[PDB]
Amino acid sequence: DEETLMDTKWVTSELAWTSHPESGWEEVSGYDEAMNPIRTYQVCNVRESSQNNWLRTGFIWRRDVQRVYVELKFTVRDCNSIPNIPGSCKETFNLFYYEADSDVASASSPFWMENPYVKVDTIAPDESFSAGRVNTKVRSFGPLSKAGFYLAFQDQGACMSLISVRAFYKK
């Protein structure tokens, strides 16, 4: 038994998450594996140096949940399949969370807050398009003690697409 706290596939308009910088992660009209229309995020600045692209979700109320699970579905381009690629190309991204007692963040505020985004994990693909298949990975974090949290993603020079994100808890 499970309950969903947030799912990107619920959204029919726009996620309108916060990209820092704007030239990094980009929201796009996309498709899941079953060709449901859904909102996706992508980033692929593979020929530029010094990439540190962050993306932060909206605020998610945690209820009374101690440990949150996060299901990510994503695709990654094999670095070595990209013509004349610099050696800095990456194939992983990082997942973080940020606990808060209220929706303190703002897309107009500076991105970095008093407390750190706390790392959940470095996420690697099982398969990368080179052809490969959509990757599905589940990670968790906690114990939580504040009213809610944000999730956040860091790219540093990969070419990938975040197809969906679902935060849930196990009952």
Number of domains, the chain: 1
CATH of the domain at 4: 2.60.120.260
* Structure tokens given for 4: 């969903």
Q: Give the integer Cα–Cα distance in Å for 92 and 76.
A: 8
The whole domain housing 108 covers 1-171
* Structure tokens given for 127: 């398969």
Angle of CA points 102, 106, 112, to nearest 5°:
95
Q: Which amino acid is at 108?
A: S
Q: Which amino acid is at 5?
A: L
Q: Give the integer Cα–Cα distance in Å for 74 and 41.
A: 9
Q: Which amino acid is at 35?
A: M
Neighbours of 69 (CB within 10 A): 17
Enter the resolution in angstroms. Answer: 2.1
Q: Give the integer Cα–Cα distance in Å for 99 and 167.
A: 14
* Structure tokens given for 143: 């114990």
Q: What are phi and psi of 46, to 5 degrees?
A: -75, -20
Q: Give the integer Cα–Cα distance in Å for 87 and 36.
A: 36
- Structure solved using which method? X-ray
Neighbours of 120 (CB within 10 A): 18
If you write DSSP's letter for every residue of the chain in order, what string do you get? Answer: -EEEEEEGGG-SS---PEEESTTS-EEEEEE-TT--EEEEEEE--TTSSS--EEEE---EE-TT-SSEEEEEEEEEB-GGGSTT--TT-B--EEEEEEEESS----SSS-S--SSPPEEEEEE--S--B-----EEEEEEE----SSEEEEEEEESSB-EEEEEEEEEEE-
Q: Give the integer Cα–Cα distance in Å for 22 and 56.
A: 12
Spacing of C-alpha 37 from chain mean position = 18
Hey, CA dihedral for 11, 13, 18, 21, is it positive or negative? positive
Across-strand partners of 155? 53
Q: Which residue has the tokens 């808890």?
A: 169
Q: Give the integer Cα–Cα distance in Å for 152 and 17.
A: 10
